[PDB]
RNA sequence: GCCGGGCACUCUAACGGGACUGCCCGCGAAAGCGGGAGGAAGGAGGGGACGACGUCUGGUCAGCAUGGCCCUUACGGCCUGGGCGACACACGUGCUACAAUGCCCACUACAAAGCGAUGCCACCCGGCAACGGGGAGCUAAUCGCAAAAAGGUGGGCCCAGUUCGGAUUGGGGUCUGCAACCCGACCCCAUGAAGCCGGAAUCGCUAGUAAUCGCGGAUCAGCCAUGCCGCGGUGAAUAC
């Protein structure tokens, strides 16, 4: 992007709940474009929420969403011949961006041989402010005011 | 299940176990209880003495295995070593024989590359 | 290099085949390689006649020649004799038994192919390359013409190192779709090389 | 796991030329560019010998050498 | 294209897996169509004067 | 009586029949459900009805030919649509909003040479 | 599973047939 | 049953013609089902443009065939009067199968 | 959709319409910018073809042509066999995979664009099969290549170097073709390697794109094509 902002994206709600975010969510997981399947994912993977737990799995996934999206970052910056990291303050669009990102590398990574499942998972431990997508979360943080000897420069 | 030569494929389906066999593959072993009756769903250890030895006197009196297989095609490697014969000397070589390029990737016959030194045009 | 030969991108909208007929899968092969050798004869036996064009008209077991030619008095010759041989000379080659019509060239200044050569056999009686030049565009540009321009291949007077000779008037928008710029190019052979030289001439608009 | 079909291939300019050879017993030196063809059991013990890309090597034919051809005799690379 | 090889590929050869295509044209003979029976080369060179009907320049 | 729409959708056509009934899609004799099994998205066919609460009382008599599965949806949602406006014309105030009357290119692009697809470049190592 | 030629997709890729992928 | 095809490289060279055959065939026989596209059959041509060595160069050509259908039922010698020797175009074929 | 019957729709294809910041609001001296609306489509609606004057003494005398020097019983011409495929290695473009968002087998559904006379081959039969014998249709919108694949349902696998991966080698066949040793593809049984996601470094791609999936053609007896040139299926992320 060098013209201009670059409009951004609308993309179509979701067929049962209805919310933009579950779509986002989604295409996150597709794979090869087979976005039938990555659909079939997310839905089984909220069937083991109700089974396992007794709350309504929309909800559940937002609040998951809410507690991973960091509100604070490092941005690399060569001030004097030197990589300086720079400590800043992160807007809507990225937090979104990031949170839905982490739940599915972290995702992934579990020990859990079915997909739907680990991504169930994920969302469950991610609320009680657990697990590994929350962990990417604080690791993330933990650099920020980490190295907060540096906020003093852009923004 | 100490079937064919000296093995004991176990704890596994019928046809994946005969896999294991240096003469059996994906093939035979499904044409070896087509001729036999048992059901390969079941597992080697859920096998009636009797399954398995209808099993075993089948194997071992029709097909070469291992205790003979591996000798077969040892010799017959020799066969045209012996001889003046092409295919022989690729054999002595450690090349490829039914004739792929030696330039490239090759490195199946040859196994770890043996790098050697070039020359400067800088 | 970059251009795109002019004609080859306007038969399109304006500017016809050399060769308008039809043909199957057995028989496009060949009856072209017949066709081809069909020139190799008007080029050879027509060269001082002002030979322009070539159109072959192709039907059943008829065929039709048409010869445009600067000076038609030649082709034909003496009351109908070398039009009679052309026939017979061109009937030992395709046993088709085809006519040869015959079209007088209005004004070969407005036939870049002609105009091309014009400069070539010039070249090659030693003439004066960049003068050469200038009065042919010249000379298209007072008849009629909305645009002329020549260029040349290389060693210009037989120099040592090949350049080019740039040159016109007029427009030639090599770019505009709906032009109508006829462009020839001749091939004279000199003592020391080859030299190619290149017509264009911008006629009309819509 | 090569093959030939339904009728295996020999070139007739040694075939008859050979065979011409065991009306009178046996021969010593042959000399036929043909390496296209199959080995015959009724060519078994003679010296055939097959060009290479140059040279005429010779070759003695044993009862074991017999489903092969002639080419796989003769080495037409020069290594090492 | 050398004229030992133009004239000399079109004699019949004692097996037909032997004739091979060249261009009535130039000569080449690494690439020519069959449809037309001329080289790459000569196919443009052609389509360009526009001396071969109906062949025009794509677009799509 | 008959309610024709037409609508096509990347390289695919499919002919819109909405009689008036109890509510239910027969695509080429088949049960909706039984042809586009498994199909999330399917769904997505219907939306334009759920649009003005005209959910049941239309019939879907619809065939389709040409472009895939996973279009043949989109497909026929638009479709759906134009046969609508002709009950009743009025009826874009809720749809046009909704934009279920619109028609984008959004075909697949001509593939290059030199290249290995629309845009895919080939890559180069040391330059 | 596209190179082993004695697989469904395995003749797919090479497009040939034989006895796993036969002509119906 | 008169069945006519008609075959051309120009489309303007057959719509033409095969109008030429639609006009005089109202005017002395009966009932015609009129000119009818087909498909129409092209041949690509994918050739370099430098005769020297850059893949990335490639010209495109093409070449189509067009087809035309002008069906004329319940035909009378007097159709075949006006439709005998009464064309024009040269770049077009016409068979006829009845 | 088989038959009548019918051109309405789908289509097919030749001509023509339609957007021009024309309208509304705001910013602007204007050009224009932002936003909205009606519209199938917006501000160049998506993609083509299309490359200025010149630059590099770019490339190419092996496409063709051509000045000049060089050979003309040979630097020419026919042929047979060999070689262009050689291998201690090294780099480029790629293809296949390391697996469960997966592999296998089975049943089932949507595509486009191409090509076809001795050519595409329906269909029957023999064979595990490649293929072969037999034989209809097509001169090709009316016949054939053809099965799209991914997808969808069922069931098998259970995290293994494995039902992942298919290299190499043994064996036995089919076909092309004068002939497949050097050096062809294909089938089938067995064999089942490296490889468990890649060092420093480095490429592509801003939307129906990428990623992924199959299909076709040119050349061509056949084929070393995982390449090239097109076709459509599904279908993102992201840009401060
Ligand atoms: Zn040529």
């Given at each position: ?84 990291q720079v400590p800043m303050e992160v807007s809507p669009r990225r937090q979104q961006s990031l949170a839905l990102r982490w739940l599915v590398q972290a995702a992934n990574q579990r020990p859990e041989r079915r997909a739907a499942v680990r991504i169930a998972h994920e969302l469950m431990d991610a609320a009680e402010g657990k697990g590994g997508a929350v962990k990417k979360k604080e690791d993330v943080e933990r650099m920020a005011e980490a190295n907060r000897a540096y906020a003093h420069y852009r923004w | 299940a100490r079937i064919a030569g000296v093995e004991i494929p176990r704890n596994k389906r019928v046809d994946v176990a005969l896999t294991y066999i240096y003469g059996i593959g994906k093939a035979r072993a499904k044409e070896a209880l087509e001729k036999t ?86 | ?206 | ?80 | ?60 | ?127 | ?24 | ?98």
């Open positions: 992007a060098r013209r201009r902002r670059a409009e951004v994206r609308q993309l179509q709600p979701d067929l049962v709940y209805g919310d933009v975010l579950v779509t986002a969510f989604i295409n996150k997981i597709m794979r090869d474009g087979k976005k039938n399947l990555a659909a079939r994912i997310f839905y089984d993977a909220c069937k083991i929420i109700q089974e396992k737990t007794g709350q309504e799995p929309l909800k559940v996934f937002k609040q998951a969403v809410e507690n991973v999206k960091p509100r604070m970052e490092v941005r690399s910056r060569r001030v004097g011949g030197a990589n300086y | 009756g048992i059901n390969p769903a079941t597992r080697v250890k859920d096998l009636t003495e009797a399954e398995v030895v209808r099993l075993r006197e089948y194997v071992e009196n029709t097909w070469k295995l291992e205790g003979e297989l591996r000798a077969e095609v040892a010799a017959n490697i020799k066969r045209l070593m012996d001889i003046g014969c092409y295919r022989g000397l690729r054999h002595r070589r450690g090349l490829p024989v039914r004739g792929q390029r030696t330039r490239t990737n090759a490195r199946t016959r040859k196994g770890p590359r043996k790098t050697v030194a070039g020359k400067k045009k800088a | 290099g970059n251009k795109i030969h002019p004609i080859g991108f306007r038969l399109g909208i304006t500017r016809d085949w050399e060769s308008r007929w039809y043909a199957g899968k057995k028989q496009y092969r060949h009856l072209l390689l017949e066709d081809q050798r069909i020139r190799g004869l008007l080029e050879k036996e027509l060269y001082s006649a002002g030979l322009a064009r070539v159109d072959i008209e192709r039907a059943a077991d008829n065929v039709a020649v048409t010869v445009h030619v600067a000076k038609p008095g030649v082709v034909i010759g003496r009351g109908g004799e070398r039009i009679r041989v052309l026939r017979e000379e061109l009937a030992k080659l395709t046993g088709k038994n085809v006519a040869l019509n015959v079209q007088e060239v209005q004004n070969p200044n407005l036939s870049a192919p002609l105009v091309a050569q014009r400069v070539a056999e010039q070249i090659e009686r030693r003439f004066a390359v960049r003068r050469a030049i200038k009065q042919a565009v010249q000379r298209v540009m007072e008849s009629g013409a909305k645009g002329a321009k020549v260029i040349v291949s290389g060693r210009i007077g037989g120099a040592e190192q090949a350049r080019t000779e740039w040159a016109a008037q007029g427009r030639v928008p090599l770019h505009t779709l709906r032009a109508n710029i006829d462009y020839g190019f001749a091939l004279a052979r000199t003592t020391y090389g080859v030299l190619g030289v290149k017509a264009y001439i911008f006629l009309g608009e819509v | 796991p090569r093959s030939l079909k339904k009728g295996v291939f020999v070139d007739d300019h040694l075939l008859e030329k050979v065979l011409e050879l065991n009306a009178k017993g046996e021969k010593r030196l042959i000399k036929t560019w043909s390496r296209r063809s199959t080995i015959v059991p009724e060519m078994v013990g003679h010296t055939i010998a097959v060009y290479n890309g140059k040279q005429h090597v010779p070759v003695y034919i044993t009862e074991n050498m017999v489903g092969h051809k002639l080419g796989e005799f003769a080495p037409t690379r020069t290594y090492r | 294209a050398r004229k030992a090889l133009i004239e000399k590929a079109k004699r019949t050869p004692k097996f037909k897996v032997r004739a091979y295509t060249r261009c009535v044209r130039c000569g080449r003979a690494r690439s020519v169509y069959r449809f037309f029976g001329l080289c790459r080369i000569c196919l443009r060179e052609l389509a360009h004067k526009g001396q071969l009907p109906g062949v025009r320049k794509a677009s799509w | 009586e008959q309610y024709y729409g037409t609508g096509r959708r990347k390289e695919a056509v499919a002919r819109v029949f909405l009689r008036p009934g109890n509510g239910k899609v027969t695509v080429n004799g088949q049960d909706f459900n039984e042809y586009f099994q498994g199909l999330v998205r399917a769904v997505a066919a219907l939306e334009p009805l759920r649009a003005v609460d005209a959910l049941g009382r239309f019939d879907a008599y619809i065939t389709v030919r040409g472009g895939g599965k996973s279009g043949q949806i989109d497909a026929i949602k638009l479709g759906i649509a134009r046969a609508l406006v002709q009950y009743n014309p009025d009826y874009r105030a809720k749809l046009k909003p909704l934009g279920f009357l619109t028609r984008d290119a959004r075909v697949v692009e001509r593939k290059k040479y030199g290249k290995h697809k629309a845009r895919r470049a080939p890559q180069y190592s040391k330059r | 599973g596209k190179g082993d030629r004695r697989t469904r997709r395995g003749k797919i890729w090479r497009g040939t047939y034989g006895k796993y992928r036969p002509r119906k | 049953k008169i069945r006519i095809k008609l075959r051309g490289f120009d489309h303007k060279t057959l719509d033409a013609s095969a109008q030429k055959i639609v006009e005089a065939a109202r005017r002395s026989g009966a009932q015609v089902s009129g000119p009818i596209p087909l498909p129409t059959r092209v041949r690509r041509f994918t050739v370099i443009r430098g005769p020297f060595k850059h893949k990335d160069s490639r010209e495109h050509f093409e070449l189509r065939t067009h087809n035309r259908l002008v069906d004329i039922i319940n035909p009378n010698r007097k159709t075949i009067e006006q439709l005998m020797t009464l064309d024009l175009p040269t770049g077009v074929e016409i068979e006829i199968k009845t």
